[PDB]
């Protein structure tokens, strides 16, 4: 246990238990921001936000592929901020 | 009568496009307008550099301009300075970053544009039209043109009534699509108006095509 002394470990508190139980019971990709991807073959690459796929809960981030750095669209889960 | 532009009819068969890029309808016109402005500026700035062909490509968000010239040293300048300034202003015109490459045309006398420019410059600099055009054919045939034709037209020597005259050596088959006929044109602004010069140079046929 974690307490003042090893002979007698101590409880937490009266209200601490209540707070822990209270919790136990109870972000926008700005255009122009430089991002990294979270998954896929393009995961963890230096991309830069190019447009806003906002109401789709999606994304589109420019990346540097075959010199034709292509307009590349990603899921919203693919951000790294 | 009226004849089709040789390069126009042969484009895609034995001739390449001067501009080679893809663009959707949203930016095709913008690309064409930028191309026109860039070509105009470069042609005027390099009027005395014997520039033969300006190939504009648009890789991604950049523009690569290749200048085919017969005088690379003038265009380049000491240690690339002139190329640098041309690039720095082409980037301004295009908006996107720019890169410039220089391609030498080894034998300018077989280049239609350069031949037309020479004849036009001579006419403006007061020379006999017959002498000038005959001298360019002789030089073209000497350097090995399979065929050549020059046509001067309009108030030759200050004559009141404009006339058209043309020389032609070798063979210049303009109805043969597989033929390689480099054709270009020039206008000489002289004290008595505009004198048009058309030059066809036939430099062999292409069977495999290769577009
Ligand atoms: Mg017709």
UniProtKB/Swiss-Prot annotation, chain A:
Subunit structure: Monomer. Interacts with the transcription termination factor Rho and with RNAP. One NusG monomer forms a stable complex with a Rho hexamer. Binds directly, but weakly, to the core enzyme of RNAP. Also interacts with RpsJ (NusE). The rRNA transcription and antitermination complex (rrnTAC) consists of RNAP, NusA, NusB, NusE (rpsJ), NusG, SubB, ribosomal protein S4, DNA and precursor rRNA; S4 is more flexible than other subunits.
Role noted for this protein: Part of the processive rRNA transcription and antitermination complex (rrnTAC). The complex forms an RNA-chaperone ring around the RNA exit tunnel of RNA polymerase (RNAP). It supports rapid transcription and antitermination of rRNA operons, cotranscriptional rRNA folding, and annealing of distal rRNA regions to allow correct ribosome biogenesis. Participates in transcription elongation, termination and antitermination. In the absence of Rho, increases the rate of transcription elongation by the RNAP, probably by partially suppressing pausing.
Domain of life: Bacteria
Family: Belongs to the NusG family.
Residue span(s) of domain KOW: 31-62
GO biological process, any: ribosome biogenesis
UniProt entry keywords in alphabetical sequence: Ribosome biogenesis, Transcription, Transcription antitermination, Transcription regulation, Transcription termination
Domain-level remarks: The N-terminal domain interacts with RNAP and the C-terminal domain binds either to Rho or to RpsJ (NusE). These domains are separated by a flexible linker.
Cellular-component GO terms for this entry: cytosol; transcription elongation factor complex
Parent-protein start and end of this portion: 92 to 180 of 181
Protein name: Transcription termination/antitermination protein NusG
Position of the signal peptide: none
